[PDB]
Amino acid sequence: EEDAGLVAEAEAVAAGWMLDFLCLSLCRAFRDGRSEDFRRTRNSAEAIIHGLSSLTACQLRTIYICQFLTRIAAGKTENDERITPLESALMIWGSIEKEHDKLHEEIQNLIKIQAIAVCMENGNFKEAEEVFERIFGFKSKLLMIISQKDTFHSFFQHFSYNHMMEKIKSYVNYVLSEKSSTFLMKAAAKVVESKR
Amino acid sequence: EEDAGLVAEAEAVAAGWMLDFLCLSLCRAFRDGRSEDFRRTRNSAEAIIHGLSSLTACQLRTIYICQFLTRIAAGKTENDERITPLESALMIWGSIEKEHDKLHEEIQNLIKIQAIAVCMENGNFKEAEEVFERIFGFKSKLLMIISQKDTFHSFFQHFSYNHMMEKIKSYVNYVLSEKSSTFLMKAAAKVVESKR
Ligand SMILES: c1ccc2c(c1)ccn2C1CCNCC1
Numbered sequence A, B: 001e002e003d004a005g006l007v008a009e010a011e012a013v014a015a016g017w018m019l020d021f022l023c024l025s026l027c028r029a030f031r032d033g034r035s036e037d038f039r040r041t042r043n044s045a046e047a048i049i050h051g052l053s054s055l056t057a058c059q060l061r062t063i064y065i066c067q068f069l070t071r072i073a074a075g076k077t078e079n080d081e082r083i084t085p086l087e088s089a090l091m092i093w094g095s096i097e098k099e100h101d102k103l104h105e106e107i108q109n110l111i112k113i114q115a116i117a118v119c120m121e122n123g124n125f126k127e128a129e130e131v132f133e134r135i136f137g138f139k140s141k142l143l144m145i146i147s148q149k150d151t152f153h154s155f156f157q158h159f160s161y162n163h164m165m166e167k168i169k170s171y172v173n174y175v176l177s178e179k180s181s182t183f184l185m186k187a188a189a190k191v192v193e194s195k196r
């Protein structure tokens, strides 16, 4: 009395629910700075995403948000990539199916500058120069900064790591708001409120 | 307006639901012989299980069933273990909180003999002897069989790999029956039936 095609469909429905639940959990961990919870949720999201072979426009946006937050999280720290985590986040950011509003351009430019600045902070100025060449192939001034190891120039005061994280966290808050109504989290919260 | 403790509770409720759903999916993949689906479901189960730090008596049984099926699946094929997959399945089997009925003892003895026989099938008779020593430290007859490379002796006709898989699959059917009513799969099926 069991139809394998209907069971495969029930598993894909459940995977879709688990995906949204894990994106919400990844968003809250990123917002709260819970590193180990972020790492655990990312692993679960990546594993659940393998149980899906066809994704809708909304599901593709969800996996790309998880991929984006994963690269941002590894920003100051392969596997098939010859670019830096922040350069990889920049490629995900520019190809998400989303409006290129002021907030999008703010995040994009903050990531572009921080991709260079995190290399300078870590003491690898040859890498900072290689990152600048891949992103920017202000250019003359920015190149002089890398060359002189001017890590604390006032340009990096406005285009700081903290500012990049603040703008990304505001975007994360919109994603948290949009996904708060998803099936899995909503049902889980009702169980918690009933206890209680 | 957000309580982190209540959100952590909602995530643990959802993890409990995802655990049961993935155990059911692991059970059907094992029963249907869907190897790649089994590998994918096992990875997701192992990742979701990390999002839990305190497990109930029922949840511990669920993770040990997943661990057991994983070792059985790798039977004919480390990571912190100096024993063979089937020897490791034998340790999980003997410590699950479950009645040691005729079916339990049938599965236990079939695994004990197959742990030796899979080494003989793979042509490693020194390993078959090392496995026999770890499990059996019939003994005199079984040791003569390994020594003479008597892989096709009639003892292995009754205690065959196919018989081991058949008895394990019957146990899997009981687990599938017991977990069919779990929240995640039940809700997923209702969506499929509504479409149809
Ligand atoms: C969350 C985080 C990363 C994720 C997913 C979901 C899905 C895929 N990935 C990457 C993609 C880049 N390489 C490593 C695996």
Ligand SMILES: c1ccc2c(c1)ccn2C1CCNCC1
Residues within 6 Å of the ligand: B042, B045, B046, B049, B063, B066, B067, B070
């Ligand atoms: C499904 C399958 C294996 C699983 C789990 C769930 C949870 C833990 N493990 C093992 C335990 C042995 N070492 C490798 C990880």
